[PDB]
Amino acid sequence: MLNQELELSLNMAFARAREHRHEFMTVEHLLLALLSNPSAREALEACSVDLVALRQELEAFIEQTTPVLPASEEERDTQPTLSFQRVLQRAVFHVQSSGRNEVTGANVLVAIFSEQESQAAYLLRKHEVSRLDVVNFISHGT
Numbered sequence: 001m002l003n004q005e006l007e008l009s010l011n012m013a014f015a016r017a018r019e020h021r022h023e024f025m026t027v028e029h030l031l032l033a034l035l036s037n038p039s040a041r042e043a044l045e046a047c048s049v050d051l052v053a054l055r056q057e058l059e060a061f062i063e064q065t066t067p068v069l070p071a072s073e074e075e076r077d078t079q080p081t082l083s084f085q086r087v088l089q090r091a092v093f094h095v096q097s098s099g100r101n102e103v104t105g106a107n108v109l110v111a112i113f114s115e116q117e118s119q120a121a122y123l124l125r126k127h128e129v130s131r132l133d134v135v136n137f138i139s140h141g142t
Contacts, residue, residue, distance in 0.1 A: 001095075003102040009037040017078035021069040022062075027083040029066075031112055031120045032058050037105030044109075046137045047129055054127045061119055083118055087111045106138045 002010070013033035017025050034040040035055050044051055069075055080088075090111040095103045113131040115121050124131075 001101050001103055002092075003039075003104050005038050006103060006105050006108065009033045009040075009105055012036070014078065020066075022078050023067040023069055023075065024079050024081050025084050026066075026081045027087050027112055027115050027118050027120045028058060028062055030084055030087060030108070031123075032062065034105050034109055037108075039107075040105035040109040043106045043134050043137050044129065047133045049127055049129050054123060054129075057123060057126075058120075061123075083115050087115060090114055100142065104142070106134070106141075110134055110138065 010033065013025060013029055016033070017029060022029070032055065035044070035051055035058070041051070044054075087108060088111075091103050091107040094111065095107050110131065112118070112120055113124065113134075
C-alpha cells in the first residue's frame with residue numbers, strides 16, 4: 001500500500017533513470033528520489049540536515065558510478081538492483097506489521113539505514129542524519 005507521494009517519487013526515479021539511460025537503479029537513486037518526497041523531506045528537515053549539500057554529493061556519486069546504456073539497442077528500460085528492492089520490501093513489511101495501511105517516503109528512508117555498507121547510508125552518516133531521530137519523528141507522526 002504505497003501512498004500517492006511515494007508512488008510519485010518512485011515513478012520519478014524510474015523516469016529520471018530512463019532519461020539518463022542508466023542501466024540500473026540502486027538504493028542511491030532511491031534516496032535521491034526521496035529528497036523531494038514530502039514525507040521523507042519533512043523528516044530530514046526536522047533533523048536540520050543540509051539537503052542541498054546531501055543532494056549534490058548524491059547526484060555526483062550516481063553520475064560517476066552508474067553505467068549509461070550505449071547508443072546500441074536492447075535493455076531500453078532500467079532495472080532496480082537488489083539494494084533498491086530490499087529497501088522497498090523492508091519498508092513495506094515493516095509498515096504491514098502492527099501499524100498503518102500506507103507506506104510513506106519516511107518509512108522508506110528508515111529502511112535505507114539498514115543497507116549498512118551502501119554509499120547512501122555512508123552519506124547519511126556523513127551529513128549527520130541520525131536514524132534515532134528519524135524514527136522518533138515518524139513514530140509520533142501518522
